[PDB]
Assembly symmetry: C3
Homo-oligomer: 333 residues x 3
């Protein structure tokens, strides 16, 4: 009745408020928010990785054992793209190479000097005819950062194999980026895309860098950290084929690009040798590279009667309490 | 009064609905759900590991420094159970070993060929009298996957020492798998079991594999990833001795068993050497192994008056609103 | 009216209950709990680390490549502070060094003996004139724990460079411990303090140890695990300069101090060599050290109208339902 629609000119809004209440609780809260669903947020995941590619550096070929570290194929690994190599260091005495350590007086060679190649003898010494610096005890000779060294251009073409297995324990549901019908031809020719082809396990390094919105040429020079986020948000009421990984790419060391003091990612490690003599020598390496972190996240939902009962009862109580209160507020005013 | 139990034939259900409301809110929601409790979900954990055992491989003994990687005793480590060893590689030119790279025409040796040992010379060469393949520049000779190599049978008997410390910061509560009264005799003789003996820090590899429902013989051959979940769900209202770790075991790379393309877990690393000459050579290793991930999770609860007041008041409002509404629905109908 | 304040002597409490209801819902729940705010708990973080310092050990200088492992500058690394070095091991036969393996009868050399240097020959042999022990096959000679070795005192002075970048994706908000206006002078001279100077990226190892409430002298000897928690809890309604990292320090392997059986943290790894001959030898290392785990956590909040509407409406319904019920309870009693 037109008297029902408007128990008054205000009262037509009684209906309206009810509509919002009905909509919100039975629409967004019950349905869009899938209140009827039981949720698993304790996702269980595993990631294994392999890198394939070859490159020329220092007039030598580099293969996965050369440029990947650490090697164990985890969800976090570095592809070395640039190196400063200091060959055949031995324990001894020598002058620091860098200008920062420049010396003219043995009094200048004390505690105040920045941390460098070793312990200070407190002596001063000639590095070159033009230059004199403080003397240190340690691995000799010291590293020489005085010219930029090139990157491994080829690295853009290396591939990352990601084998990701996830499980939602509550629903005994298991799936992975590698579908059971995946075949050797597929691995050989499939081309990864976050929308077009979510289940190609092979990712091209250069592609990962571009998705993260980075320029390989710059990134390889500075070194950096990229994140490969893999998201499994699955509605198990829907089809098993509807549950697919969602890939997101970003550069995790965002501070680096905005900073003058530290622009990238590098670290130092050494290769250790011994002479037949049994004297000890090593090759020092300063590795610049791209670190990849594979981060997996997920939640899964399935229909279950228990929540459906509790949520719907909650829905009726709420729509009811809402209507009862809107009437009351209206009655006095 | 019998008139109270049934204010009508329907009205006996008024009581019943009240019972469900009373039960649900003051039973499950208040008690079974421990509403009276304050909860810490920000569990703080630490894990350190050590592996002990010896094995024969390649007619040599292997000890923890040989088969465990990485070595730092973290919550994630690999026990190498199978290896393909390529001894004394040097930088140079040579023919790819695998059949996949088979050659008869130098035109066949170009970009299309799968990633392998190095960069292609574009040349073609003889690997053997029977076989001719493409030529590569890199570490030589290339690896030869043409016969299966055996596993380290003994690995089933290696032991894993897990020292796990957890803390619930809110309650200043600290406990670990290693109880304070644990003694050298105990470490020497205690036998781990998830129900029978939760605080033996020593886990037998073979046992871990069986709990994960895996066959060591197969797992060692393919390589794989097992998860050791340690759960600390503690009711601090209960006794400190009631708070014990709950161990769960599974194989994390579930995709592997269901897939033809990639059945396991392996990775490649190298050992680097130099001649007195100063020419560089390395030993290439393809390691198959079991990776163990120790994953710790927990939440802790203690009685606190503040929630007890708020929850119980919430309980009374809810039982009350429920009864008020059930009466109303009944009155009009 | 004084009749309003007290509709009765009890009824003055009707007002009071309303006050608590008003206060709680519109005070603590709406405001102190920032109900008006939209929250991001899916914090995104990255951490890169570098260690700088030199030390004397075994009458040799040790630099970052010597005492830091693993080297890749992650949020988890070890600074080796103590070592038991076993030089030039070769594959062969020899007697176990430790007293635990003491022998007089070849029958004593069987399965029951604890895991040690290798596989048992089942033979018995003389380690020294005074001592006879079981014979093993493996890397020889076996390690000798018979005298305590010193720590690297200097390690207290090493520095940790932490470059931490975080992002709250929801708000497109990015910040790091390294502010954009940070300069070379700053890195050179700034002194870290959790309250006084949260954005100095350089942390002094000894300082980290003291903040964790530990004695370096003891910690370096046993080895241990320290946690560096970095917390980003930011109110984006407030100023961008108000969002600062909060640093917390602790010792994660708490079980260790309370236990006789295992007091610290150590692990074993080896350096591998080859003779020109091509026979294989290695140097075995038992590393004691401090492991640092950088753990980043955060949540961020910003004002948003959508929650403000829903929360405030929720607030009015709750204050209203509360008052309605308190009146009712009063009317019958
Ligand atoms: N552990 C540390 N203690 C003190 N200063 C450090 C430390 N690690 C890095 N720094 C300084 O912070 C700045 C940026 O470091 P970053 O590694 O990003 O650049 P870098 O030039 O590769 O550093 P370096 O070559 O000195 O190792 C440099 O001035 C570096 O000396
Ligand atoms: N980074 C990668 N790029 C391209 N293909 C890869 C990569 N990593 C692995 N694959 C391929 O995926 C398949 C399964 O890899 P998996 O490592 O499980 O087996 P595998 O035979 O040990 O691999 P391989 O011996 O070639 O390193 C193989 O055909 C392998 O060549
Ligand atoms: N994987 C393991 N299997 C059996 N026992 C172990 C294992 N790891 C450690 N233990 C034992 O637990 C005790 C404490 O180990 P911890 O490493 O803390 O001290 P440790 O003396 O350095 O050990 P070790 O020197 O024997 O490697 C020791 O008795 C040690 O033998
Ligand atoms: O609130 C998180 C929850 O709902 C979200 O809802 C989105 C909706 O999907 C969009 O269409 C748009 O209307 O904005 C809404 C925010 O209120 C998201 O769907 C998702 O984050 C989550 O399920
Ligand atoms: O809902 C999660 C919460 O309660 C759970 O309740 C279980 C109960 O323990 C079982 O006896 C059975 O009745 O199923 C209930 C599910 O509603 C669990 O106890 C636990 O996951 C958690 O505390
Ligand atoms: O309840 C967690 C939530 O509120 C907390 O409130 C604290 C308050 O900050 C203190 O002043 C004191 O009154 O104890 C309250 C606990 O009810 C905290 O502020 C914080 O953990 C969080 O925001
Ligand atoms: C990547 O590989 C393709 C061949 O598939 C080649 O054409 C291209 O030049 C390579 N890019 C780089 C940077 O080496
Ligand atoms: C492989 O299985 C998936 C499972 O959903 C399916 O979507 C896909 O079409 C299948 N591929 C082929 C070639 O049948
Ligand atoms: C080993 O020989 C090198 C030069 O060939 C020399 O520097 C060193 O002193 C020798 N080692 C010993 C222990 O004499
Ligand atoms: C494991 O060790 C026991 C001795 O305690 C031995 O009897 C058994 O044969 C071993 N198993 C394997 C697979 O080596
Ligand atoms: C060691 O302490 C725990 C602490 O709860 C106790 O359960 C156990 O019985 C104790 N063991 C012995 C041998 O007293
Ligand atoms: C080192 O000797 C090996 C063979 O003994 C040879 O292949 C290599 O060319 C030599 N290195 C140099 C730099 O001459
Ligand atoms: C740490 O360095 C300072 C110099 O800045 C020195 O005075 C002090 O003795 C050093 N401490 C240790 C333990 O070496
Ligand atoms: C650097 O920027 C931060 C940003 O909040 C500010 O707090 C600080 O005062 C600035 N430092 C200088 C020297 O201006
Ligand atoms: C290498 O020489 C060492 C001693 O110099 C000897 O122990 C070993 O048997 C030799 N290797 C071979 C394969 O003969
Ligand atoms: Na530098
Ligand atoms: Na595909
Ligand atoms: Na292969
Ligand atoms: Na026990
Ligand atoms: Na020992
Ligand atoms: Na500062």
């Amino acid at each position: 009745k037109s008297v029902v629609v408007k128990s008054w000119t205000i009262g037509i809004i009684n209906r309206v408020v009810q509509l919002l209440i009905i909509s919100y609780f039975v629409g967004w809260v019950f349905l869009h928010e899938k209140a009827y669903q039981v949720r698993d947020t304790a996702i269980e995941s595993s990631v294994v990785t392999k890198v394939k590619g070859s490159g020329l550096y220092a007039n030598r070929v580099m293969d996965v054992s050369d440029y990947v570290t650490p090697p164990q194929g985890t969800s976090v690994f570095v592809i070395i793209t640039k190196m400063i190599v200091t060959e055949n260091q031995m324990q001894g005495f020598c002058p620091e190479s860098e200008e920062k350590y420049r010396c003219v007086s043995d009094s200048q060679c004390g505690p105040e000097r920045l941390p460098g190649g070793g312990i200070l003898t407190g002596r001063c010494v000639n590095y070159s005819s033009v230059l004199r610096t403080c003397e240190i005890q340690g691995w000799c000779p010291t590293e020489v950062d005085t010219v930029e060294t090139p990157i491994m251009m080829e690295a853009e073409n290396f591939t990352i194999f990601i084998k990701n297995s996830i499980r939602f324990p509550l629903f005994n549901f298991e799936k992975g980026n590698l579908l059971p019908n995946l075949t050797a031809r597929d691995m050989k020719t499939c081309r990864f895309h976050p929308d077009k082809d979510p289940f190609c396990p092979i990712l091209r390094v250069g592609d990962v860098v571009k998705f993260a919105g980075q320029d390989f040429a710059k990134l390889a020079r500075t070194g950096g950290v990229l994140g490969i986020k893999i998201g499994w948000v699955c509605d198990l009421d829907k089809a098993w084929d509807q549950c697919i990984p969602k890939y997101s790419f970003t550069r995790l060391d965002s501070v680096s690009e905005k900073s003058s003091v530290s622009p990238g990612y590098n670290f130092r490690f050494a290769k250790y040798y011994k002479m037949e003599n049994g004297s000890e020598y090593r090759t020092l390496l300063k590795a610049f590279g791209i670190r990849f972190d594979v981060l997996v996240y997920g939640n899964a939902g399935k229909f279950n009667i228990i929540p459906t009962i509790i949520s719907s009862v909650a829905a009726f109580t709420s729509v009811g309490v809402g209507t009862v209160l809107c009437d009351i507020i209206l009655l006095n005013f």
